[PDB]
């Protein structure tokens, strides 16, 4: 989380002799930008380490960052970073809150395939945008994502089978992330902000292992 005037560092690295590294920027919906690099540029500041540093108060970032790394002289296959997104916030500072919407039983009764949607509660300004995660292991199949009061838009959707969503397991960790003070609220950086989505059967079973202990105690 970057409050205005602060500094943020995000790192990229390679270990298989990529002689060229670059940082890419993507404005979600209509923009794609390139960030200057130095293996041996506005609003942003060794061959195995690749740092990205913020040393300006520019509020117009409002984008997603990608890291680049590839060989030179061969066919030229490109390898890209997963992504990174930042923050701009001029007390009044508030990171948008994300929420989870589970499917109902009607969808699985009719079509027998589920659909998961998670939402981030919006505000007048912007700079919140990228995708989400799941089960502490990023699944890369069937993933889909993406006015107001004059005091951006991003909702993700997943196609799921009826036998796939049923569990609390297959845990959907919805988070669009500002990666990373005189207000009663905690510091803006805080941590990963996420809304999380039968295991209660397992918990009940571990509970009646209590009875499994009563039996041994009695005998």
């Amino acid at each position: 989380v970057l409050k205005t005037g602060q500094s943020m560092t995000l790192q990229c690295a390679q270990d298989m002799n990529h002689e060229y590294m670059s940082w890419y920027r993507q404005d979600p919906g209509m923009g794609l930008r390139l960030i200057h690099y130095s293996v041996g540029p506005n609003g942003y500041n060794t061959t195995e380490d690749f740092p990205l540093r913020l040393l300006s108060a520019a509020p117009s970032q409002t984008s997603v960052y990608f890291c680049a790394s590839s060989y030179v002289g061969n066919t030229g296959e490109l390898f890209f970073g997963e992504g990174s997104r930042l923050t701009v916030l001029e007390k009044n500072v508030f990171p948008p809150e994300v929420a989870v919407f589970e499917p109902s039983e009607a969808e699985i009764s009719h079509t027998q395939k589920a659909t998961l949607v998670c939402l981030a509660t919006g505000f007048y300004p912007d700079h919140v945008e990228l995708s989400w995660w799941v089960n502490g292991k990023e699944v890369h199949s069937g993933v889909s994502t993406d006015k107001e009061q004059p005091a951006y838009c991003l909702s993700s959707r997943l196609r799921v089978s009826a036998t796939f969503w049923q569990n609390p397991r297959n845990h959907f960790r919805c988070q669009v992330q500002f990666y990373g003070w005189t207000q009663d609220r905690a510091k803006p950086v805080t941590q990963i902000v996420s809304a999380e989505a039968v295991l209660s059967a397992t918990i009940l079973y571990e509970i009646l292992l209590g009875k499994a202990t009563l039996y041994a105690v009695l005998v």
Binding site: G136, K137, P168, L199, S200, I203, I207, L208
Partner: protein
Amino acid sequence: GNHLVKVSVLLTCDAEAKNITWFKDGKMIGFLTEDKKKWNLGDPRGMYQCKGSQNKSKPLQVYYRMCQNCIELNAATISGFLFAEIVSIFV
């Protein structure tokens, strides 16, 4: 700086190499090699720290509560509780 101890029940000590030694509550409990980057529980409810640098590193405290449900006396959970309990101790 530091903060090299991070927490599918996995415990990690990143940025280290060669012998990694695991300390649970300050005592020698586990050896980790170069090719392995993870340590697993097998509720951890323990106090842990990792030694790859001089006198270990910044320690971490962990403990886990099983029921992700059980916000309050939830009706479904309460029903499961009362049925299972009544049968189990009437026998």
